[PDB]
Amino acid sequence: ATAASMNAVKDSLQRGQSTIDVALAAGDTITDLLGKMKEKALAASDTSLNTASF
Amino acid sequence: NALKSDFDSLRDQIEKAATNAKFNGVSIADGSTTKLTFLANSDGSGFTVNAKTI
């Protein structure tokens, strides 16, 4: 019985792996968007821009 | 009187030429602003260029 009970342990570990995989995909999206936001802040920091570009 | 009239016309033409010196709504020669700052790094470091009124 103790040996057969390991199936639930393996299933729970696999489910945790899937949860972390989804989290990493979302994190990659968030990092790309954060890089774009950095570039927008850098571009807007310039004082020679007109009102429309800002 | 003719020389004085040509003097006045050239003075007005300088004033107009100084007025029209703009690039996308900003200018470094008409005296609109004291200085312009441009990006010099990803950290937002500037490239100060003091304006020279003409």
Swiss-Prot record, chain A:
It comes from the Bacteria. It is found in: Secreted; Bacterial flagellum. Belongs to the bacterial flagellin family. In C.crescentus, the flagellar filament is composed of multiple flagellins of 29 kDa; 27 kDa and 25 kDa. Flagellin is the subunit protein which polymerizes to form the filaments of bacterial flagella. This is Flagellin FljK. It comes from Caulobacter vibrioides (strain ATCC 19089 / CIP 103742 / CB 15). The chain holds residues 57 to 110 of 273 of the full protein.
